[PDB]
Write a protein that binds this ligand. Structure first.
Ligand SMILES: *[C@@H]1O[C@H](CO)[C@@H](O[C@@H]2O[C@H](CO)[C@@H](O[C@H]3O[C@H](CO)[C@@H](O)[C@H](O)[C@@H]3O)[C@H](O)[C@H]2NC(C)=O)[C@H](O)[C@H]1NC(C)=O
Ligand SMILES: *[C@@H]1O[C@H](CO)[C@@H](O[C@@H]2O[C@H](CO)[C@@H](O[C@H]3O[C@H](CO)[C@@H](O)[C@H](O)[C@@H]3O)[C@H](O)[C@H]2NC(C)=O)[C@H](O)[C@H]1NC(C)=O
Ligand SMILES: *[C@@H]1O[C@H](CO)[C@@H](O[C@@H]2O[C@H](CO)[C@@H](O[C@H]3O[C@H](CO)[C@@H](O)[C@H](O)[C@@H]3O)[C@H](O)[C@H]2NC(C)=O)[C@H](O)[C@H]1NC(C)=O
Ligand SMILES: *[C@@H]1O[C@H](CO[C@@H]2O[C@@H](C)[C@@H](O)[C@@H](O)[C@@H]2O)[C@@H](O[C@@H]2O[C@H](CO)[C@@H](O)[C@H](O)[C@H]2NC(C)=O)[C@H](O)[C@H]1NC(C)=O
Ligand SMILES: *[C@@H]1O[C@H](CO[C@@H]2O[C@@H](C)[C@@H](O)[C@@H](O)[C@@H]2O)[C@@H](O[C@@H]2O[C@H](CO)[C@@H](O)[C@H](O)[C@H]2NC(C)=O)[C@H](O)[C@H]1NC(C)=O
Ligand SMILES: *[C@@H]1O[C@H](CO)[C@@H](O[C@@H]2O[C@H](CO)[C@@H](O)[C@H](O)[C@H]2NC(C)=O)[C@H](O)[C@H]1NC(C)=O
Ligand SMILES: *[C@@H]1O[C@H](CO)[C@@H](O[C@@H]2O[C@H](CO)[C@@H](O)[C@H](O)[C@H]2NC(C)=O)[C@H](O)[C@H]1NC(C)=O
Ligand code: NAG
Ligand code: NAG
Ligand code: NAG
Lengths: 133, 49, 195, 49, 35
């Protein structure tokens, strides 16, 4: 039921690793399960933080964890290194950076920012050419 | 060289301390899909006398 | 499969595991709560070397173990010593507090302990900022609850009655199996030479 | 396997409360598990829709 | 279609941006009316 008809979050119930799926095979007087499991294989060290401080506001990952290669900060998913640039869509806010122990200072990007800023340059290049008459 | 019975205090595993710190994490950069056999009895022979 | 160890710096985000971790200074390597548990269940021996030079004499008049031995009922030792089980339990504990759950799935991956507790809080549907905003309270309250456990096991034996009654059932079964030799089964004598 | 090497969503299986983590301790012929559980403590009423 | 649904405002975090962008626009228009 729980390894063949489903997927199991019960640790080491469907073999070692994290359970993907399993295949039953018959044998005399019994059953063989071929369990398939994802196993996290090659690892790399990173520096990490519980939160980021930006506008005095403290920030946490919506999903995933904060890491640094030593010079830049990224959000990444807990189980596999894929770094993302720390946006307002990767993170959520609470309190201010007096409260969280071990918090670190880095910018948090806003994907609305260039989309208004490049529209400010459109607005300005029109206002300036509108001076010509 | 030759073969004989030795006796020994059994080893529990490899000694393997870990690089813990209050600001470091290890993340897997690659993975292995693994397949492992698990075997269970389900019956025994029916028997009559 | 690996034996993990705690690092020299015993700091875990204010969580005080020193009551449940090993003590390198003690000859038996078990924890403080383990040293409590090993005094709370009192044993019908571990099969250790009842060598005749011990109990060929006055001892077997007031020792049920040497009396059972003269009837061929004997206790064999376990394959894993209580120091071997302490080393396994120490590795499971060092694995947990340094690596989270990842030491179950594959290689151990270090994580700071306050970030492990955050991952966990998300597991119960409480958002991780609620840990960090309260980390001093959560730690002091955990450290207090580990205190309640220590004092509870200091107060009474009765709680370990579940492990003691396993020991008492084997002691009672062998003492009965000795008493059964008192029976005549309807023969002229219990004792065989009197036939 | 499920309360020490993991965290379990299974109710009651690792103590009263939402499970966080557990620590094993050995005993004569047994194991003792010190389960740590998150328990809700001071509720207030609210209107909801 | 929903039993027990209730009226309240739902805030829009893009709204104060485009409102601040309206005031920024109209100040330019006031500037270009000035000379
Ligand atoms: C940490 O990760 C960073 C992101 O991968 C990485 O920084 C990036 O490095 C490359 C060059 O190695 C830069 O590429 C740019 O280089 C010059 C100067 O800016 C430009 O002329 C090029 O066109 C190109 O854009 C990236 O811009 C740079 N990223 C940032 C955010 O600056 C670091 O090198 C990594 N650090 C460590 C310690 O590994
Ligand atoms: C993370 O970034 C913060 C913002 O730059 C920074 O906070 C700033 O820290 C300095 C040094 O303590 C403060 O300097 C002032 O401190 C007192 C007033 O509280 C004055 O008497 C001093 O003369 C001095 O002007 C800044 O006021 C403070 N700014 C804020 C908004 O708090 C943190 O220090 C940074 N932390 C790290 C680890 O990078
Ligand atoms: C939640 O907000 C709704 C929008 O303001 C509101 O709906 C409005 O309620 C009034 C009263 O029922 C309606 O007024 C009309 O009632 C009948 C026709 O339906 C006529 O006799 C009247 O002349 C008048 O036209 C509004 O038309 C109605 N609007 C909508 C969009 O449904 C709800 O009543 C509010 N409910 C609560 C509990 O807050
Ligand atoms: C991850 O790093 C730890 C230690 O951190 C680094 O240690 C230095 C060598 C240097 O790289 C610094 O920038 C970091 O502080 C490694 O732990 C070491 O492991 C080796 C065996 O591989 C052992 O001989 C050392 O004594 C260990 N030292 C410490 C401090 O732990 C660990 O090996 C690294 N793991 C990976 C996968 O890179
Ligand atoms: C949650 O509220 C209930 C009942 O609602 C309240 O009723 C009034 C007393 C008034 O305060 C309203 O505005 C509230 O909506 C509480 O239930 C009552 O509790 C009192 C003791 O405090 C008891 O005498 C009554 O018999 C209870 N009534 C019922 C229907 O059981 C309840 O105690 C509140 N919970 C908390 C944590 O305060
Ligand atoms: C972790 O908790 C233990 C108690 O459970 C603390 O150990 C006690 O410390 C005080 C002050 O030094 C002593 O008077 C007690 O006798 C100690 N008890 C034991 C069993 O040693 C320990 O100090 C705490 N750790 C930290 C870092 O505070
Ligand atoms: C949450 O409950 C805890 C107690 O379980 C409260 O912590 C205590 O707060 C009092 C003052 O209210 C202090 O004197 C104690 O020292 C605190 N105990 C600990 C272990 O820190 C806490 O104040 C409550 N918080 C909220 C937001 O209700
Ligand atoms: C300037 O305004 C005129 C209309 O007055 C238009 O034809 C021209 O394309 C505009 N150029 C720019 C760069 O805005
Ligand atoms: C961790 O931070 C503490 C202070 O909270 C400090 O005493 C300790 O030396 C640090 N250790 C490491 C390995 O970062
Ligand atoms: C209009 O804008 C210019 C800059 O382009 C500024 O110097 C000037 O003060 C503004 N005029 C008024 C009346 O505010």
């Amino acid at each position: 039921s729980e390894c063949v008809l489903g997927q199991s979050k019960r640790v080491d119930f469907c073999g070692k690793g994290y359970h993907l799926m399993s295949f039953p095979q018959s044998a005399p007087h019994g059953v063989v399960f071929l369990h398939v499991t994802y196993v996290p294989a090659q690892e790399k060290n990173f520096t990490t933080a519980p939160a980021i401080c930006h506008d005095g506001k403290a920030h946490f990952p919506r999903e995933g964890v904060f890491v640094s290669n030593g010079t830049h900060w990224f959000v990444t998913q807990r189980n596999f290194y894929e770094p993302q640039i720390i946006t307002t869509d990767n993170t959520f806010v609470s309190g201010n950076c007096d409260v969280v122990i071990g918090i670190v200072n880095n910018t948090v990007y806003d994907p609305l920012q260039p989309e208004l800023d490049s529209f400010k340059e459109e607005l300005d290049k029109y206002f300036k050419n509108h001076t010509s008459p | 060289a030759s073969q004989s019975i030795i006796a020994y205090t059994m080893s529990l595993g490899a000694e393997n301390s870990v690089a813990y710190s209050n600001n470091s994490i290890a993340i897997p950069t690659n993975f292995t899909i693994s397949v492992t056999t698990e075997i269970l009895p389900v019956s025994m022979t029916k028997t009559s006398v | 499969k690996q034996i993990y160890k705690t690092p020299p710096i015993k700091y875990f985000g204010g969580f005080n595991f020193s009551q449940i971790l090993p003590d390198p200074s003690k000859p038996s390597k078990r924890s403080f709560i383990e040293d409590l548990l090993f005094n709370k269940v009192t044993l019908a021996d571990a099969g250790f070397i009842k060598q005749y030079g011990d109990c060929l004499g006055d001892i077997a008049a007031r020792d049920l173990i040497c009396a059972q031995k003269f009837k061929g009922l004997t206790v064999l030792p376990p394959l894993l010593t209580d120091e071997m089980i302490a080393q396994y339990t120490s590795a499971l504990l060092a694995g947990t507090i340094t690596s989270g759950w990842t030491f179950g799935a594959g290689a151990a991956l270090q994580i700071p302990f306050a970030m492990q507790m955050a991952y966990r809080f998300n597991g119960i549907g409480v958002t991780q900022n609620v840990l960090y905003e309260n980390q001093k309270l959560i730690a002091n309250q955990f450290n207090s609850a580990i205190g309640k456990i220590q004092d509870s096991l200091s107060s009474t034996a009765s709680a370990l009655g579940k492990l003691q009654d396993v020991v008492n059932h084997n002691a009672q079964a062998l003492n009965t199996l000795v008493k059964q030799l008192s029976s005549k089964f309807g023969a002229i004598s219990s004792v065989l030479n009197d036939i």
